[PDB]
Point group: C3
Chain length 249, copies 3
């Protein structure tokens, strides 16, 4: 594991000397804004399971995952997490995880960006299962404060986004109204199929975390023109969220 | 996957030219007209017996025996027979199950029309790469149970309805676990149904589900003697499809 | 499976003729130090094991102790976590005392306390029985209506009067979020830990009586080194007495 990380790191190092401070995990508007972009295809990167883009956003050096991994694709949880460990050793200090989510909270609207304040793991998989390298992180990571209080406060002082709890589920089929009523009872505001594994990895290796959700739809039980409109709304709202997060870090 | 389906389909086609409209999944068979039986042990890529024939003049494909994740099967393996049914030509699936009644109004021996499902198995037969020719990457599960099929069934039978929660098993639940499931809104608990329903929705089949209550669930306080009620439910479902 | 059991059993037999009545499953003190005529067998030497077994007597009663246990977060198959319990059955035990470390969800529980677990919720979504079943070992579909032996628990409680709670088993290894813990509280859990469920399912399967004790190590998420040392000592001595009582009243 540590050998795989080193191998991938060396590969990257030979293509960019950037010392990025922030990893950004995305599923145009924002990527197109990156300054002096260096692109590295996932297909060329040792031990990867898409493209990494390195460069600067508001003068700050960043590493962007243009494309991410999901347990519904068949990936082992550790594979999903590996790019995050790679980021740590390339030198990042924080991770912005974005996701697409169904709104369980009826006050949320499709197209909105929600600051995720906490997570629930309903995937019942964990990238840490198996023997642990204490050089990478502890056996039993504290998940008492997943979202960095200061980072979120500085972001919120600028953007004043809605906040919500995110529940991660395996997918790939969507949820039933019965399932969604369960999640509502259990306190979730948003449901998606990503985020949890990479957030667990990030906390493990000691990175700071913020998470944004883009509401793609109201969850089950709760026009193409409308998907067009909401897709446009989210793109520009997420660009501002992401830029703010980079700038205040 | 599509190759395994085609191989199984050719096998079946060489034994029955029936174009069945409905797949019936059973753990009534004696009533089937002109029955053609095919052992699961002979069918390419199967994990029991298929019975083809007619019920109230309508052609059907029956799974006399089904698969459960508690047996050790991969979810995709549990789902395969359903994809095979699709390509043999069925349009609907009637899934039966045995269930424990969490709703204390239900009594052992009753047939309940299942109105929705909760997946508490945390397994999905779709995990892994998806063939878009079979069905979409992200199936809609907003209306699993076909509203019209269920309405026509209910107009005849007026069954109780309930929410079915699928669990792995094979050990039964503790009273603490059953109180969880009650809080979460489940009326019935069983160890089947969910994987084959997910597969059906994926490949675009209509679905109805019936549960036979075999017992009150843990903490609250037979499929053979219920065979008559289930026979009527099944026959109604076929007839109104 | 039955062949693996017999192989391990023969290995043990050749080192101890004890006919132990009770298996005690511990995480790793004064309790082990108290065992009489202790015979120690390393897990590394035991056929088909995934720590040390210690055989001997506690208040004159012969016992088999697992000094060290297994967790699904380590990467073990559920059936592997369960195997020592089957082995215990065939060595002759009739009862199991499962200990664990747990986070207190119930705000009336304090770190360092021992709680008598009255029932379990499996939120690991793994089961050691998945796959084909040997009916000589136990039934295909074990009843879990009364996991904790009513009489054993009653005789323990008559002596100790411990708090009781519902234990939820989860995979880990990362700890829970405050959101996750509010889920568990709503679902009726008093304690959360990462062990117990697989071995208890196994035990019920093969027909052993079961009692479970939790040692509160901390309040769960969202609910001092000196205080760690204070509660650690408190727990040790409290668990010794719980364990000794359980053996004595069996
Ligand atoms: N699980 C789930 N994931 C999503 N990703 C985007 N929308 C949704 C949804 O409604 N449910
Ligand atoms: N899980 C579960 N499955 C069942 N199948 C039939 N009865 C029951 C029950 O009580 N619980
Ligand atoms: N899952 C879980 N396990 C534990 N083991 C000891 N303390 C804890 C806790 O707070 N949560
Ligand atoms: Mg060995």
């Amino acid at each position: 594991m540590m050998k795989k990380i080193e191998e991938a790191r060396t590969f990257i190092s030979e293509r960019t000397n950037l010392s990025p401070d922030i990893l950004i995990i995305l599923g145009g508007p924002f990527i197109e804004k990156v300054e002096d972009p260096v692109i590295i295809d996932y297909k060329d990167i040792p031990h990867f399971p898409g493209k990494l883009v390195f460069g600067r956003i508001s003068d700050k050096p960043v590493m962007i995952m243009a494309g991410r991994f999901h347990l519904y694709e068949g990936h082992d949880p550790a594979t999903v997490a590996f790019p995050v460990y790679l980021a740590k050793y390339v030198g990042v200090k924080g991770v912005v995880v974005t996701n697409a989510a169904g709104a369980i909270n009826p006050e949320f609207k499709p197209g909105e960006i929600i600051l995720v304040r906490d997570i629930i793991n309903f995937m019942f998989r964990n990238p840490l299962r198996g023997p642990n390298d204490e050089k990478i992180g502890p056996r039993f990571p504290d998940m008492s404060s997943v979202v960095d209080p200061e980072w979120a406060r500085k972001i919120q002082e600028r953007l004043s986004l809605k906040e919500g709890v995110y529940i991660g589920v395996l997918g790939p089929s969507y949820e039933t109204p019965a399932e969604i009523r369960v999640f509502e009872k259990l306190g979730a505001d948003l449901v998606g199929m990503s985020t949890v594994p990479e957030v667990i990895a990030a906390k493990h290796c000691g990175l700071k975390v913020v998470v944004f959700s883009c509401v793609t739809n109201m969850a089950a039980g709760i026009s193409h023109e409308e998907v067009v409109r909401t897709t446009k709304m989210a793109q520009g709202k997420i660009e501002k969220a992401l830029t703010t997060a980079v700038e205040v870090f």
